[PDB]
Amino acid sequence: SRGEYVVAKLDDLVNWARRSSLWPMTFGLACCAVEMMHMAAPRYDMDRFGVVFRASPRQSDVMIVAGTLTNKMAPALRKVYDQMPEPRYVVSMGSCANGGGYYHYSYSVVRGCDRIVPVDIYVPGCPPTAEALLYGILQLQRKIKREKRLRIWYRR
Amino acid sequence: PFFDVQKRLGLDLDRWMTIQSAEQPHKIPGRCHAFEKEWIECAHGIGGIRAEKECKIEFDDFVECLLRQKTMKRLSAIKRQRDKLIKEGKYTPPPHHLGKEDPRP
Amino acid sequence: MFMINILSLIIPILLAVAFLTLVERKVLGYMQLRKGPNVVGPYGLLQPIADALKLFTKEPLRPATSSISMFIIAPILALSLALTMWVPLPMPYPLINMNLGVLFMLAMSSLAVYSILWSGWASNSKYALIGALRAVAQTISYEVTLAIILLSVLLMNGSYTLSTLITTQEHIWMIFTSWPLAMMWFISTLAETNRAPFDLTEGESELVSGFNVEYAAGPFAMFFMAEYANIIMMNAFTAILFLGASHDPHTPELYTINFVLKTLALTITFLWIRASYPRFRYDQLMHLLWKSFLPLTLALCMWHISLPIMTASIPPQS
Amino acid sequence: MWFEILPGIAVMAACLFIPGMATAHIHKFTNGGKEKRVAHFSYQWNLMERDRRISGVNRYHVTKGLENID
Amino acid sequence: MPLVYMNIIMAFAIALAGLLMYRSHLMSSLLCLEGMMLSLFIMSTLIILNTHFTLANMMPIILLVFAACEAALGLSLLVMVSNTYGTDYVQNLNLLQC
Amino acid sequence: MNIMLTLLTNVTLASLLVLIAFWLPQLNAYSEKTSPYECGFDPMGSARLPFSMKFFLVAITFLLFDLEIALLLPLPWASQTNNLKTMLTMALFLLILLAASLAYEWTQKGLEWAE
Amino acid sequence: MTMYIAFILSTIFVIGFVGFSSKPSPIYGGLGLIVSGGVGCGIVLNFGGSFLGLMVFLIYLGGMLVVFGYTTAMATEMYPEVWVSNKTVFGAFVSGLMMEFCMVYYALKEEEVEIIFKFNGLGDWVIYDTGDSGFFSEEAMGIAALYSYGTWLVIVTGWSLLIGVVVIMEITRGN
Amino acid sequence: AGRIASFLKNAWAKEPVLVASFAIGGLAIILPSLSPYTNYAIRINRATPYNYPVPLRDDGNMPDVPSHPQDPQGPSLEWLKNL
Amino acid sequence: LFQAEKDRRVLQMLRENLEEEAIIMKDVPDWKVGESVFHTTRWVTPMMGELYGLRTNEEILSATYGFIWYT
Numbered sequence A: 001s002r003g004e005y006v007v008a009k010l011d012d013l014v015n016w017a018r019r020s021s022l023w024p025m026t027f028g029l030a031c032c033a034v035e036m037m038h039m040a041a042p043r044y045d046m047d048r049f050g051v052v053f054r055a056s057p058r059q060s061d062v063m064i065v066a067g068t069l070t071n072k073m074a075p076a077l078r079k080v081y082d083q084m085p086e087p088r089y090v091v092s093m094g095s096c097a098n099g100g101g102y103y104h105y106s107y108s109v110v111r112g113c114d115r116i117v118p119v120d121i122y123v124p125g126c127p128p129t130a131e132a133l134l135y136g137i138l139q140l141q142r143k144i145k146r147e148k149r150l151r152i153w154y155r156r
Numbered sequence B: 001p002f003f004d005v006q007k008r009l010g011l012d013l014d015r016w017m018t019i020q021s022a023e024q025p026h027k028i029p030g031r032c033h034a035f036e037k038e039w040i041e042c043a044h045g046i047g048g049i050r051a052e053k054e055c056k057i058e059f060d061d062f063v064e065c066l067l068r069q070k071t072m073k074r075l076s077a078i079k080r081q082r083d084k085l086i087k088e089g090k091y092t093p094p095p096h097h098l099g100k101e102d103p104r105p
Numbered sequence C: 001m002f003m004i005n006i007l008s009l010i011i012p013i014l015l016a017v018a019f020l021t022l023v024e025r026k027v028l029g030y031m032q033l034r035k036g037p038n039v040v041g042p043y044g045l046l047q048p049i050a051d052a053l054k055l056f057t058k059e060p061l062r063p064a065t066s067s068i069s070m071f072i073i074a075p076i077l078a079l080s081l082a083l084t085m086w087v088p089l090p091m092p093y094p095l096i097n098m099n100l101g102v103l104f105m106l107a108m109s110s111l112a113v114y115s116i117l118w119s120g121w122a123s124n125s126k127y128a129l130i131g132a133l134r135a136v137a138q139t140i141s142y143e144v145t146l147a148i149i150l151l152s153v154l155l156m157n158g159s160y161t162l163s164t165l166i167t168t169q170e171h172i173w174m175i176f177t178s179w180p181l182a183m184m185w186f187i188s189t190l191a192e193t194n195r196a197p198f199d200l201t202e203g204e205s206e207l208v209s210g211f212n213v214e215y216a217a218g219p220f221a222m223f224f225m226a227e228y229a230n231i232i233m234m235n236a237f238t239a240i241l242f243l244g245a246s247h248d249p250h251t252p253e254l255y256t257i258n259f260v261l262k263t264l265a266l267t268i269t270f271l272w273i274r275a276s277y278p279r280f281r282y283d284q285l286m287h288l289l290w291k292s293f294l295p296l297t298l299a300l301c302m303w304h305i306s307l308p309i310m311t312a313s314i315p316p317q318s
Numbered sequence D: 001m002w003f004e005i006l007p008g009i010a011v012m013a014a015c016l017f018i019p020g021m022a023t024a025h026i027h028k029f030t031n032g033g034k035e036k037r038v039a040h041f042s043y044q045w046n047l048m049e050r051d052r053r054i055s056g057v058n059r060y061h062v063t064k065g066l067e068n069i070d
Numbered sequence E: 001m002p003l004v005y006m007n008i009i010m011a012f013a014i015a016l017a018g019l020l021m022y023r024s025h026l027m028s029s030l031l032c033l034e035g036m037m038l039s040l041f042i043m044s045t046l047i048i049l050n051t052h053f054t055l056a057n058m059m060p061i062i063l064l065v066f067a068a069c070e071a072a073l074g075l076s077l078l079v080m081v082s083n084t085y086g087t088d089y090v091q092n093l094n095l096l097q098c
Numbered sequence F: 001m002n003i004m005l006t007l008l009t010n011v012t013l014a015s016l017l018v019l020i021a022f023w024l025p026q027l028n029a030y031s032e033k034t035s036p037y038e039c040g041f042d043p044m045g046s047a048r049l050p051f052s053m054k055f056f057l058v059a060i061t062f063l064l065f066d067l068e069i070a071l072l073l074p075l076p077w078a079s080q081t082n083n084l085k086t087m088l089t090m091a092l093f094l095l096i097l098l099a100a101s102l103a104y105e106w107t108q109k110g111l112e113w114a115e
Numbered sequence G: 001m002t003m004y005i006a007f008i009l010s011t012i013f014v015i016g017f018v019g020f021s022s023k024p025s026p027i028y029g030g031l032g033l034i035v036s037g038g039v040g041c042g043i044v045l046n047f048g049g050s051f052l053g054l055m056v057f058l059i060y061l062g063g064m065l066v067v068f069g070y071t072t073a074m075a076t077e078m079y080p081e082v083w084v085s086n087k088t089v090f091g092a093f094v095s096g097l098m099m100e101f102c103m104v105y106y107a108l109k110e111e112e113v114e115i116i117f118k119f120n121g122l123g124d125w126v127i128y129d130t131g132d133s134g135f136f137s138e139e140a141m142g143i144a145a146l147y148s149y150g151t152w153l154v155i156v157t158g159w160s161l162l163i164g165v166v167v168i169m170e171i172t173r174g175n
Numbered sequence H: 001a002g003r004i005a006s007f008l009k010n011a012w013a014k015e016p017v018l019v020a021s022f023a024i025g026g027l028a029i030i031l032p033s034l035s036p037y038t039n040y041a042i043r044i045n046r047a048t049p050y051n052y053p054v055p056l057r058d059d060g061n062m063p064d065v066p067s068h069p070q071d072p073q074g075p076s077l078e079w080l081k082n083l
Numbered sequence I: 001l002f003q004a005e006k007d008r009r010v011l012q013m014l015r016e017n018l019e020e021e022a023i024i025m026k027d028v029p030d031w032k033v034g035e036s037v038f039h040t041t042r043w044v045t046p047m048m049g050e051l052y053g054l055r056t057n058e059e060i061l062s063a064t065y066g067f068i069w070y071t
């Protein structure tokens, strides 16, 4: 039909716009934040993909949970997740953020950041190499590309 | 009170600005130079008390030049009568007023 | 036909700002031994479009504690003034030919600061309030020195008309006559646009984005375009004031090309300075301007009052 | 690359090209192609008004030479 | 008199009343003072321009200058008042009676 | 005519951009998202508390200095009088008084911020 | 009758004066004063006073910025007031607006005398002089005559500014 | 004249900005008095014809008043052409 | 020449206005046409409300705001 083509093209344009410019929040916790820094280093240069850090949650698109999430820190992480305007995505980096990792059985470590915030991509490692995190970001870009919002709205 | 030291020492500290017809830069004239000059020349010397009676005509002309109240009253009456005649339908304004008529260099 | 001129002045400035941002990322990246945006399009040429589309399709939120009216009004004022203060610039024919272009530009630049202040106050957050106070301090530091520098430089032009600056320096650049004022004016322009090392209003490492910390999607974008338009505009003003170009009345394209090239050189210098230096402190900036810049400016102003009378070279058009 | 910065700059330059020339062209198109008159003082405005009045077509840019005086 | 003159005069009257009402703060009264200054400046410059009084053109500028002094003066006092009470409320200025 | 047309066009464009920004995307705001922003936790006091000004004296001095430029800006036209000696003397006198006031405020520790 | 541009500007001037004259939390008072200053600059622009208007607007903007800082430092409360957040502020604002509207209507319909003298109306364009000028600007020449004619004014103004600096230093000295 | 040399050296070593500003201000204050070109500037200012030169009615006793702009009498700006 | 032309243009407008006033005010009982408002008998420059008083709006706008609004 005609409306289907229009909504498909508009959805493709919006998905490309959101994918080609991801602004992760400047938010690191532990060891994995060093590899997050090394992603921005000249060798890998995440900025060339349109991925640039921004400090304020209101001006951020992606949260990268890079490090252990302790019980004392969980309210802060949830609060800064809630303040990010939609659409928002969460990328879990490292074993500590994935499922507790080395400190899984500790009394003061949240066993996975997925208990506090919904996670889109899980990056395994301790710490994941900067190439692994770059692959995770590209996978998130592909996942954003696959999504179909306007097409679903039209078929309602 | 008024300790006139300017007159004693001949200084002219602030008298250059008191009136509108006193040596403007580049000889730019005031809007009511003639009326103010005439009133000043009439009232000079006789005194303040007499100048409010004998030089009343010149001061009235100066005030009329300054505020143009009588001219505005006359123009408003003229336009009121003109618009009333237009509403009744007897005036039929000329082309020059309309703007149809040709301008002159 | 005038609306055509208005649109032809407005839209290209917005496009230049959008690509200016792309240029800044690339220039900084190469300087930092990396590449910068080169994936979104050929040589990253589609990056600003993606940024704008992302920002204007994202949810804008009004904070609960915020005062809605001022919060909305501030970015509108910022963008409107940023677009407005472009009109009197002669390139080589100004859109609005005004008798006193410089005074109007000063007044609009002084009004521009209020938008930053209103946004900071209306955000109703501590970081935004600190950013607004820093803006107040910065304006207090730089305004008087900027005005006196402008007066001292324009004393050799003869009038405040911007078009007369083209014929004032028909033979030799004004920078060869008042280069100390040129450097002081450059530093004042850096401080006026809230640019590094004077970007204290935002203060990414201190105030976590500062005054616009609460502006999410659209108004934040408008603030960004306003700031970058101010950058390009103020640098173009500096190029016109100090680096005069040759104007042939039968071919203004030559002057337009020269003026655009000089403006681009100054903007690239701005990005260079941002990439090269650490950030000042908002009291050291005030001390630097009042303590060092002000005494020199007053002395220079006296010198440039005396010089035309000393050498019998008073400019025309009283 | 270092020359890959050149394309974007060029585009920006092209954008900065658009206003200036456009304004000039518009002026010409609206003033008979002869550099729209500048009226900073009252004397120049009076001259423009006189030209408009004697043009006979209510446009100041329609200049009348010696052929209009027989 | 044209409507503009009467509008400026009414603006002056409104600013004067606002100064004389003294709601709660001290800064608001200072703002009313600056408003009265601005209204006087506008009235004076309109009068000067209408009658082509050339030498009187520097009269408003001098006016403006002293305005600042007044404003500056007020602000200075305000500061000291705050430093005594932590608030610029006019209710606190009641130590001396008649 | 032209200047107010320019101002109206710019204001209309900015307002239209704000309208598109606020009405196009999907809005989902709840009480937690729109809360005031501290780094991670709730603010203790309020942003409307008095905030000390350590450079108040510099602010008042700027208030006084902002009219020295108002007095000095007509110099390009003033330099065209017949008696250049008087105009030069007056301008130099005004600038000297400005410099003397600045020096007085400098020596009396008026430019140092409050502790 | 000619679009009433000066009339509209003067009305906005009075409206801003009413807005900031009800003393609503000086931030908004500062906004009202800025609006009034800009509109007055436009008004005197319409009469040929370019330098004075821009000058007045420029001076006021600088002054307001200092004031915004001072109300943030010393004149703030928990819940800053606004024109609709208080009964007394709204009452004063509405009373001022109604008084302005009533005077405007009475002066437009009839030549009514309120305080000073009667009403004229018929637009303010009538009083403009038809006389022409030369290659100079009358306002610019009159203002620049300060340094050649007004030596006394310059002297007293400079002394006033220096004494003002000394005075603010002495007042805020403390002890 | 001996201590002032040490004071100048100390000022130049510690605060050169103030020294430069004071030197520039002093130069701008003194030099215009000694400049012989100030009178030329005054004459150039006086020679600019802003307003119309109103003719004088001939009473038969004006030998220095030209009867025509091209007549040899009256002020001449030949000094300006060489300047 | 401009001065000579201006005097003629000014005089013509006044004459045109005076003739129109004489036509209009013929039925008002106690109106003297062309009556001055000044006690003096010398020449007073027109107020520019007396010149373009009876003309159309665009003429008035060009007369009073033409120069200021031209940029």
Ligand SMILES: COC1=C(OC)C(=O)C(C/C=C(\C)CC/C=C(\C)CC/C=C(/C)CC/C=C(/C)CC/C=C(/C)CC/C=C(\C)CC/C=C(\C)CC/C=C(/C)CC/C=C(/C)CCC=C(C)C)=C(C)C1=O
Residues within 6 Å of the ligand: A026, A027, A028, A029, A030, A033, A036, A037, A040, A047, A052, A053, C014, C015, C017, C018, C021, C025, C028, C029, C048, C049, C051, C052, C053, C055, C221, C222, C224, C225
């Ligand atoms: C060991 O101990 C530890 C620390 O100690 C050392 C830590 O620190 C720490 C925390 C640290 C981590 C969180 C890691 C943080 C990473 C590092 C600290 C630094 C890494 C990178 C930095 C941030 C440096 C970045 C600087 C670079 C140069 C990047 C570039 C800078 C940008 C900010 C400038 C560009 C700005 C943005 C990209 C926005 C621009 C986009 C615009 C707004 C869009 C354009 C505008 C449009 C709206 C125009 C629209 C107009 C239209 C007309 C256009 C046309 C559109 C139509 C459709 C046609 C941890 C955890 C730690 O353990």
Ligand SMILES: CCCCCCCCCCCCCCCCC[C@@H](O)O[C@H](CO[C@H](O)CCCCCCCCCCCCCCC)COP(=O)(O)OCC[N+](C)(C)C
Residues within 6 Å of the ligand: A009, A010, A012, A013, A016, A019, C039, C040, C046, C049
């Ligand atoms: C206000 C005026 C403007 C209005 C809106 C128009 C904005 C301009 C549109 C911008 C066009 C560019 C979009 C696509 C760029 C091409 C990039 C290409 O590669 O995208 C591919 C597919 O792109 C999309 O399919 C195309 C999207 C464009 C949709 C066309 C819409 C046209 C605009 C219509 C707007 C209004 C419609 C009319 C109704 C109102 C997928 O690539 P991707 O995997 O990611 O990246 C590869 C990474 N590598 C290189 C490392 C391997």
Ligand SMILES: CCCCCCCCCCCCCCCCC[C@@H](O)O[C@H](CO[C@H](O)CCCCCCCCCCCCCCC)COP(=O)(O)OCC[N+](C)(C)C
Residues within 6 Å of the ligand: C041, C042, C045, C046, C049, D011, D014, D015, D018
């Ligand atoms: C008066 C003249 C003014 C000129 C001003 C100066 C120049 C301004 C122009 C700015 C230059 C923009 C950079 C463009 C680089 C070229 C990119 C292009 O080569 O890539 C193509 C992008 O193609 C886009 O259509 C071109 C978009 C560039 C124009 C957008 C600039 C925004 C201003 C106007 C917006 C209107 C957009 C209308 C077209 C959508 C590939 O996309 P696409 O072919 O798809 O492939 C994906 C689809 N597949 C998978 C099915 C094959």
Ligand SMILES: CCCCCCCCCCCCCCCCC[C@@H](O)O[C@H](CO[C@H](O)CCCCCCCCCCCCCCC)COP(=O)(O)OCC[N+](C)(C)C
Residues within 6 Å of the ligand: F016, F019, F020, F023, F024, F025, F026, F027
């Ligand atoms: C870039 C510069 C140039 C741009 C030029 C174009 C300017 C565009 C104007 C800016 C608005 C664009 C926004 C796009 C969406 C429209 C927003 C709104 O007006 O539409 C609906 C508003 O409609 C109302 O809900 C109901 C309207 C019922 C009243 C009818 C209007 C009166 C007409 C009488 C009816 C007769 C037939 C109507 C057709 C003429 C949306 O309601 P709401 O859900 O809240 O908002 C969320 C929108 N989402 C879903 C896209 C996220």
Ligand SMILES: CCCCCCCCCCCCCCCCC[C@@H](O)O[C@H](CO[C@H](O)CCCCCCCCCCCCCCC)COP(=O)(O)OCC[N+](C)(C)C
Residues within 6 Å of the ligand: B011, B013, B023, F083, F086, F089, F090, F093, G148, G149, G151, G152, G155, G159
């Ligand atoms: C005489 C009494 C002395 C004791 C009292 C002293 C207290 C008062 C302070 C100084 C008195 C000011 C008197 C100056 C009046 C100005 C008139 C005179 O001076 O001539 C002027 C000449 O001015 C000279 O420059 C001298 C004045 C310079 C004064 C130096 C400033 C120092 C004064 C001290 C107090 C200032 C504050 C503190 C400073 C430390 C202008 O003459 P001219 O231009 O031909 O004609 C103009 C008219 N035209 C245009 C139509 C042709």
Ligand SMILES: CCCCCCCC/C=C\CCCCCCCC(=O)O[C@H](COC(=O)CCCCCCC/C=C/CCCCCCCC)COP(=O)(O)OCCN
Residues within 6 Å of the ligand: C180, C182, C183, C184, C186, C187, C238, C242, C273, C288, C292, C293, C296, H017, H020, H024, H027
């Ligand atoms: C014969 C009669 C001639 C009359 C003489 C006239 C010439 C006078 C000669 C001297 C002129 C010197 C002018 C210097 C201007 C002020 C500089 C200054 O003194 O300030 C610096 C500080 O200035 C800065 O550091 C600013 C840093 C900002 C860096 C920005 C980028 C650096 C430069 C980039 C290129 C500049 C381009 C200039 C021209 C641009 C084209 C328009 C000193 O500060 P402190 O070190 O803290 O010392 C005081 C504490 N004891």
Ligand SMILES: CCCCCCCC/C=C\CCCCCCCC(=O)O[C@H](COC(=O)CCCCCCC/C=C/CCCCCCCC)COP(=O)(O)OCCN
Residues within 6 Å of the ligand: C291, C294, C295, C296, C298, C299, F096, F099, F100, F102, F103, F106, F107, H011, H014, H015, H018, H019, H020, H021, H022, H023, H024, H025, H026
């Ligand atoms: C009558 C002539 C007037 C015209 C010329 C002047 C025009 C304007 C220039 C002066 C502006 C105001 C000057 C203010 C003076 C302030 C002095 C001061 O107290 O500052 C001292 C510092 O300054 C000093 O060292 C004292 C004065 C030093 C010398 C000042 C000038 C002396 C004369 C120099 C030039 C001599 C003549 C020129 C010779 C040129 C060589 C041939 C305090 O140090 P801080 O920076 O505040 O704090 C440091 C600790 N953290």
Ligand code: SF4
Residues within 6 Å of the ligand: A030, A031, A032, A033, A066, A067, A068, A093, A094, A095, A096, A097, A101, A102, A125, A126, A127, A128
């Ligand atoms: S996953 Fe490993 S490297 Fe990363 S924060 Fe946890 S312990 Fe450190």
